[PDB]
Structure 1
Amino acid sequence: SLAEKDIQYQLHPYTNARLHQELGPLIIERGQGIYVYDDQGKGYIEAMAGLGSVALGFSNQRLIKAAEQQFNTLPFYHLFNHKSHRPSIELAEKLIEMAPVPMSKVFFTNSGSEANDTVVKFVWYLNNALGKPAKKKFISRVNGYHGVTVASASLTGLPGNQRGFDLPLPGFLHVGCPHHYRFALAGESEEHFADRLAVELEQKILAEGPETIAAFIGEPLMGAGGVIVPPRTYWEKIQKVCRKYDILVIADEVICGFGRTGQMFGSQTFGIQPDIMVLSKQLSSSYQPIAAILINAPVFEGIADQSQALGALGHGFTGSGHPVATAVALENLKIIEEESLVEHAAQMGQLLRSGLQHFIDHPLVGEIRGCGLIAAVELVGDRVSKAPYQALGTLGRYMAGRAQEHGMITRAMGDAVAFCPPLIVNEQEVGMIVERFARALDDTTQWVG
């Protein structure tokens, strides 16, 4: 069977390989709109838009035709050694012109992981160029997600990405997860919590030596880490501390980018003025692997000078700016703008968050959080202590399983069940997401007894 071939031949990401050999895969055969279907014909609402990525859903014919048109023109070329092609140029123009702060240049990669890995290299290159060879350390947050390369998994603050992999590398430092529900002191306001987090960062900078800190990287809100919305004034106060010590501010917009948070960028929603932005996922509705780094004028000018001194910029992926991936991403961004999907997502997000808020006084619901069209419900075994049932992740695993039985694919991040549906979701579809959540919660409540 196809399931037997999968067990025989494929090592799965983010999977227990031994349990996989026993249970085998859930094979997804086809998709349309917000739905995917398994090889048994069962339909599921993809309430996660795959990996928070399939902005236009699973059957956008404009994207598919844009791919075809580019395939029949030039199915591959590269950007190395002054070579270029129209789709990379037009996408770079569109990204610079839509940027929420003045940006200078785009550098393309295949993945968010490659993009953040590239940012690490470009910052080291820059500070070598500027004659600041000590100015190399990165600061990220506990539970931040920045990808899975040796370097980007060192930026990542999730233990699952580091345990067994000898990470983080030296020079990749982590400050606190800005989650008020878990880390605020008894009776501390969001603004007081923000103050204390800004103090933690400043103290980290001073303890390490300000001259040794190159950059601070953060997702405007933390996606994979559990839909962690930072406290009011966090980004204002963190940026003050960064500007104080000449530290680059990198906005990882891989999840927030292109209308997820109710504005085009999380940087807009949270008032971030980044030096560098990283984009992926919704950039192409994941129809093609592509990511993009936006760098501002000072970062470009330093890198450009050093590329002249060293002969050429000694960095690039075969797939960097791939003409089919860039053609698809260009068409994707045009549809998001033409169909007013940022404002549509914002409206659908209000319906999603209001629907979930009906469950705020349920005995297993610890917290409901989110912004725009991304949300999470954190389940607890006890609301007073905020303790898990059995161990962190038991409730989340059972909930996600019940949601799948009720025809909805959701992701558990510990005991948080996440929602990140396609931007094209309609009002009754939001209603059906909340209904399938409710059925899964009922099942989980009966199970915990």
Structure 2
Amino acid sequence: VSSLPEKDIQYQLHPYTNARLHQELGPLIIERGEGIYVYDDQGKGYIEAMAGLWSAALGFSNQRLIKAAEQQFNTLPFYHLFSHKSHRPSIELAEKLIEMAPVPMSKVFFTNSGSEANDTVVKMVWYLNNALGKPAKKKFISRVNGYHGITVASASLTGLPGNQRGFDLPLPGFLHVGCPHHYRFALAGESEEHFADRLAVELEQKILAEGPETIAAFIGEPLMGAGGVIVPPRTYWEKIQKVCRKYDILVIADEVICGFGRTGQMFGSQTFGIQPDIMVLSKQLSSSYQPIAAILINAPVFEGIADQSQALGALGHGFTGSGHPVATAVALENLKIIEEESLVEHAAQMGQLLRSGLQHFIDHPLVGEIRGCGLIAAVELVGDRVSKAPYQALGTLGRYMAGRAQEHGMITRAMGDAVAFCPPLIVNEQEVGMIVERFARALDDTTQWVGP
């Protein structure tokens, strides 16, 4: 048998893993990928219904991206953007991002990860408000169950307890308002629109209690990804933005998951009617073939930063890999493919098929909710549909269900007791059918396990 599992146990500390259990069980070693599939070291194939980490838009064997990497490696395999240095793929990618943006944007700043990007945005907003002579205007508002990454600062923006417990987070000045999840937080008989009203009132009261002059920015994923595929209620973003504009608070759209065709349009900001001052992009940006993220800032944000960078000598910020030529070349080619192959439209089509397939299970006794938009969805299981209570404890069903899905050849992700769907954009109709079938088998297993 392969030496790899023992070596993995001996030498790797895994993210998002119980380290002690890992020492007992060892890894599931993924050996290779092609199309929407990955294969373990025993040769078993799985539909990667998460596209890896919400990210492999073009699947696991796109030869154009691979050749784009090769072409750039053979030209200039590393360079940087520090001190006026530049290079073609960062320039052409920045051009393309600005010109495809759903609202007018001024500049792009590159990082490696979504976490670094949001961390950078925090720093940029502080820097901006200092430049503007508003030293108190520094607080960020985000939402319960939001996920913005896991640096010290971005984990503070994040609203999931799993990212904060044990880590002494959030830092001060990172405030949280309600998760816009109607199923869990609406009143009995309350409409989506009235639920949205109540959330907007909550935001305004929070701004008032803190002192509006101390609030710099509001950040949100158009729909929440890692926190549960939570679609906000109708009118939420309209009403929330009105509150933000009233108090001169920046609106930051975290498009790390929603970006590049996930939600039925190119950006989640389009789908949900968001006019952000700043956008954060990653993941599908490069089909995760290279680590890269991008921040788009509008004109007022750029102008204030630019002014301060002059007064303070240079902008004292940047990663070694910021705009890495291979990562930018791969992302550029990736965006071209998404456009040329009409994958936004195709994904929207496939998403309707996914959602209608799943909706066959709406009356199942363990299905509490089916939600989603475009080609992202979740099914939330419960132990009792009237009370919405979990079986045993929150997470017990989702853990079992995700494990059963894997046994039936599908990789999903449990988010508490919901299981997620975020397949590659290139998924076809029968493959959507198979995703639903493998969900159904896992659901059948879970039902028998829970028992009468």
SS in 2 for 1:145: coil
**Structure 1: distance between partners of 2:387 and 2:217:** 36
**Structure 2: distance between partners of 1:195 and 1:433:** 36
**Structure 1: distance between partners of 2:193 and 2:390:** 27
**Structure 1: distance between partners of 2:424 and 2:414:** 18
Q: Does 1:375 align with 2:386?
A: no
**Structure 1: distance between partners of 2:64 and 2:342:** 16
Question: How far is 1:375 from its partner?
Answer: 0.3
State how many pairs are aligned: 449
**Structure 2: distance between partners of 1:138 and 1:291:** 21
For residues 110-162 of structure 1, the C-alpha deviation after alignment (integer angstroms, 9 at most, x for no partner) is 00000000000000000000000000000000000000000000000000000
Question: How far is 1:366 from its partner?
Answer: 0.1
Question: How far is 1:163 from its partner?
Answer: 0.2
**Structure 1: distance between partners of 2:191 and 2:350:** 29
For residues 304-337 of structure 1, the C-alpha deviation after alignment (integer angstroms, 9 at most, x for no partner) is 0000000000000000000000000000000000
**Structure 2: distance between partners of 1:363 and 1:243:** 44
For residues 271-308 of structure 1, the C-alpha deviation after alignment (integer angstroms, 9 at most, x for no partner) is 00000000000000000000000000000000000000
| TM-score, normalised by the number of residues in structure 2 | 0.99
**Structure 2: distance between partners of 1:346 and 1:187:** 31
For residues 399-427 of structure 1, the C-alpha deviation after alignment (integer angstroms, 9 at most, x for no partner) is 00000000000000000000000000000
Question: How far is 1:78 from its partner?
Answer: 0.2
Question: How far is 1:257 from its partner?
Answer: 0.1
For residues 34-65 of structure 1, the C-alpha deviation after alignment (integer angstroms, 9 at most, x for no partner) is 00000000000000000100000000000000
**Structure 2: distance between partners of 1:199 and 1:185:** 15
Question: How far is 1:105 from its partner?
Answer: 0.0
Question: How far is 1:252 from its partner?
Answer: 0.1
**Structure 2: distance between partners of 1:77 and 1:48:** 32
Question: How far is 1:438 from its partner?
Answer: 0.2
**Structure 1: distance between partners of 2:196 and 2:113:** 31
SS in 2 for 1:12: coil
For residues 379-401 of structure 1, the C-alpha deviation after alignment (integer angstroms, 9 at most, x for no partner) is 00000000000000000000000
**Structure 2: distance between partners of 1:424 and 1:117:** 31
What is the CA RMSD across the aligned residues, in angstroms? 0.2
**Structure 2: distance between partners of 1:446 and 1:2:** 35
Q: Which runs of 5+ in 2 are unaligned?
A: none
For residues 45-91 of structure 1, the C-alpha deviation after alignment (integer angstroms, 9 at most, x for no partner) is 00000010000000000000000000000000000000000000000
Q: Does 1:171 align with 2:183?
A: no
1:270 aligns to what? Answer: 272
**Structure 2: distance between partners of 1:42 and 1:141:** 39
For residues 168-192 of structure 1, the C-alpha deviation after alignment (integer angstroms, 9 at most, x for no partner) is 0000000000000000011110000
Question: How far is 1:31 from its partner?
Answer: 0.1
Q: Does 1:343 align with 2:345?
A: yes
**Structure 2: distance between partners of 1:192 and 1:352:** 29
**Structure 1: distance between partners of 2:405 and 2:369:** 19
SS in 1 for 2:207: helix
**Structure 2: distance between partners of 1:239 and 1:190:** 17
**Structure 1: distance between partners of 2:438 and 2:299:** 48
> Alignment identity in percent?
98
SS in 2 for 1:44: strand
Question: How far is 1:25 from its partner?
Answer: 0.1
Q: Choose the corresponding residue for 2:161, options 159, 162, 184.
A: 159
2:221 aligns to what? Answer: 219
For residues 247-273 of structure 1, the C-alpha deviation after alignment (integer angstroms, 9 at most, x for no partner) is 000000000000000000000000000
**Structure 2: distance between partners of 1:243 and 1:406:** 49
**Structure 2: distance between partners of 1:54 and 1:400:** 20
**Structure 2: distance between partners of 1:389 and 1:343:** 39
SS in 2 for 1:255: coil
**Structure 2: distance between partners of 1:163 and 1:403:** 29
**Structure 2: distance between partners of 1:81 and 1:52:** 34
SS in 2 for 1:107: strand
2:442 aligns to what? Answer: 440
For residues 15-35 of structure 1, the C-alpha deviation after alignment (integer angstroms, 9 at most, x for no partner) is 000000000000000000000
Q: Which runs of 5+ in 1 are unaligned?
A: none
Question: How far is 1:432 from its partner?
Answer: 0.2
SS in 2 for 1:417: strand
1:74 aligns to what? Answer: 76
**Structure 2: distance between partners of 1:191 and 1:426:** 35
Q: Does 1:34 align with 2:57?
A: no
Q: Choose the corresponding residue for 2:47, options 45, 54, 63.
A: 45
**Structure 2: distance between partners of 1:372 and 1:88:** 30
Question: How far is 1:109 from its partner?
Answer: 0.0
2:183 aligns to what? Answer: 181
Q: Does 1:425 align with 2:451?
A: no
**Structure 2: distance between partners of 1:165 and 1:441:** 35
**Structure 2: distance between partners of 1:107 and 1:263:** 23
**Structure 2: distance between partners of 1:391 and 1:165:** 23
Question: How far is 1:214 from its partner?
Answer: 0.1
Q: Does 1:316 align with 2:318?
A: yes
2:262 aligns to what? Answer: 260
**Structure 2: distance between partners of 1:391 and 1:126:** 45
**Structure 1: distance between partners of 2:185 and 2:73:** 51
**Structure 2: distance between partners of 1:104 and 1:292:** 13
Q: Choose the corresponding residue for 1:354, options 349, 353, 356.
A: 356
Runs of 4+ in 1 over 4 A off after TM superposition: none
SS in 2 for 1:31: strand
